[PDB]
From a paper:
To define the molecular underpinnings of metavinculin's unique functions we solved the crystal structures of full-length human metavinculin (124 kDa) and its tail domain to 3.4 Å and 2.2 Å resolution, respectively. Rather, an α-helix of the metavinculin insert (coined H1′) and its amino-terminal extended coil replace the H1 α-helix and its amino-terminal extended coil that are present in Vt, which are no longer part of the MVt domain but are rather disordered in the metavinculin structure. Indeed, the H1′ for H1 replacement in metavinculin results in a new five-helix bundle (that is comprised of α-helices H1′ and H2–H5; residues 959–1,130) that closely mimics the five-helix bundle found in Vt (comprised of α-helices H1–H5; residues 891–1,062), where it can be superimposed with an r.m.s.d. of 0.69 Å (for 153 equivalent Cα positions). Thus, the true helical bundle MVt domain (residues 959–1,134) lacks the H1 α-helix of vinculin. However, a comparison of the tail domain structures of metavinculin with that of vinculin demonstrated that α-helix H1′ has several additional interactions with the four-helix bundle H2–H5 compared to α-helix H1. Specifically, there are two additional hydrophobic and hydrogen bond interactions in metavinculin, and there is also an electrostatic interaction of Arg-1107 with Glu-976 present in α-helix H1′, whereas the corresponding residues in Vt do not interact.
Residue numbers in the entry: 961 to 1116, 1123 to 1129
Write the structure that this text describes.
Amino acid sequence: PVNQPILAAAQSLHREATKWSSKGNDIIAAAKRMALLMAEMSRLVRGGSGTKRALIQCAKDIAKASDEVTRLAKEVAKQCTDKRIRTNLLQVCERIPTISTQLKILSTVKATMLGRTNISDEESEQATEMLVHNAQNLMQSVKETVREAEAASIKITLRWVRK
């Protein structure tokens, strides 16, 4: 069914995001959608063909959800009194648009490769491993962004309720 390391990265973010309720928290909601979509991604990279259009669109959905995470976490940071946390939170959540832009590039590469041209099992495996590493980086960054966004809120209209 799956590419295990992508699914594991997805579950890793799911575990952090499900510490809290989505109610009145769109960072939490977006992060949960990201983890669910990234699990779908691991199915798609490990299915196919037929999965070409789906691979591209799934990455687009993930990138859209990550813009919401980024946008909100930047607002949290810029209300945070602790410079140490504020700076760290700005540092991480400003990696995210680049990583999720990279997710869209590498998914399209994996999906479409060289168009009509024939491709080896080596190029195919290499393209998988590029995608894998980028997915782990993304899941890591958002998980760190969730943790720090909550840490920063202690120093401050966003709701953190433990489940």
